[PDB]
């Protein structure tokens, strides 16, 4: 199963790890992608997960968008996990760098509650511009299912743990 995770709460765990490497190692039932509303997996976690699937995630995502239109900020969709997981839950957290409402971060985390266990990144953190400390607090106060958080940045991981 998941290994080397520090327990933060009854249901939230955290590890300093690259989510792609965690997914290849564990092959979880659900890997969360930090998606945008268009499912254009260019950078950050999205670009890295898509690259690990050899672009299969992007082709599937483009077919989903062509059929259904874009997601909402705070929304999600379940697609294939390809070689990384059974499923990929593409969750859209607000992108603060685009002036998207930070209160939608709680809505984005609520999508995790539809799944018993997930491997996930901190939503809206990194290139999305939100404060990762705030993202972890919203995560622990919103998610009731088992979430295994993979934080890529070591210095960020230490700050998140020491300030929790
Ligand atoms: C290039 C690989 C990469 O960006 N990996 C990332 N893992 C996380 C958890 C965020 S970004």
């Amino acid at each position: 199963s998941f290994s080397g995770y520090l327990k933060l709460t009854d249901n939230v765990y955290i590890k300093n790890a690259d989510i792609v490497e965690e997914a290849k190692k564990v092959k979880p039932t659900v890997v969360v992608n930090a998606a945008n509303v268009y499912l254009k997996h260019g950078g950050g976690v999205a670009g890295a997960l898509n690259k690990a699937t050899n672009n299969a995630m992007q082709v599937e995502s483009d077919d989903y968008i062509a059929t259904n239109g874009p997601l909402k900020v705070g929304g999600s969709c379940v697609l294939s996990g390809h070689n990384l997981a059974k499923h990929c839950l593409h969750v859209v957290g607000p992108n603060v760098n685009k002036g998207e409402d930070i209160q939608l971060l709680k809505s984005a985390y609520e999508n995790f509650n539809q799944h018993e266990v997930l491997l996930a990144p901190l939503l809206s953190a990194g290139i999305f511009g939100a404060d990762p400390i705030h993202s972890l607090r919203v995560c622990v106060d919103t998610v009731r299912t088992n979430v295994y958080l993979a934080v890529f940045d070591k210095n960020l991981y230490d700050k998140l743990v020491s300030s929790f």
Side-chain angles (χ1 to χ4, degrees):
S1 49
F2 293 90
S3 73
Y5 282 78
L6 171 63
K7 187 166 177 61
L8 296 176
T9 74
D10 171 60
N11 64 294
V12 181
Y13 297 80
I14 194 166
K15 188 181 179 182
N16 176 26
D18 168 358
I19 199 173
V20 169
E21 301 311 307
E22 280 300 300
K24 293 179 184 181
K25 159 172 182 51
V26 176
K27 296 183 190 182
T29 303
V30 180
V31 63
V32 172
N33 179 26
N36 56 50
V37 301
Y38 306 110
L39 300 183
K40 288 300 183 176
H41 312 306
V45 167
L49 290 176
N50 179 55
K51 179 173 145 212
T53 74
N54 179 43
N55 211 50
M57 175 178 287
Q58 189 63 72
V59 171
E60 179 198 23
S61 294
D62 288 344
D63 171 83
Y64 173 94
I65 296 290
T67 299
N68 300 287
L71 277 62
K72 285 171 190 180
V73 173
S76 73
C77 70
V78 178
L79 291 176
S80 179
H82 301 275
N83 58 313
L84 299 174
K86 171 164 197 188
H87 291 308
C88 177
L89 178 69
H90 295 272
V91 180
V92 183
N95 190 325
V96 170
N97 292 321
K98 297 172 163 54
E100 301 171 351
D101 180 11
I102 199 58
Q103 252 283 76
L104 299 166
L105 183 55
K106 189 167 182 75
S107 302
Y109 275 115
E110 285 168 348
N111 293 284
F112 289 25
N113 292 326
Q114 301 294 319
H115 301 276
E116 169 186 315
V117 189
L118 319 87
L119 167 58
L122 277 173
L123 299 176
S124 298
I127 64 172
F128 282 62
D131 173 18
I133 291 176
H134 174 64
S135 187
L136 175 61
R137 180 58 54 194
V138 176
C139 180
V140 304
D141 292 345
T142 310
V143 185
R144 300 177 300 282
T145 57
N146 294 331
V147 54
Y148 290 82
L149 295 169
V151 175
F152 184 62
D153 197 277
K154 186 242 186 220
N155 293 310
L156 173 56
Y157 173 80
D158 295 345
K159 174 141 187 59
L160 287 167
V161 169
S162 65
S163 65
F164 185 71

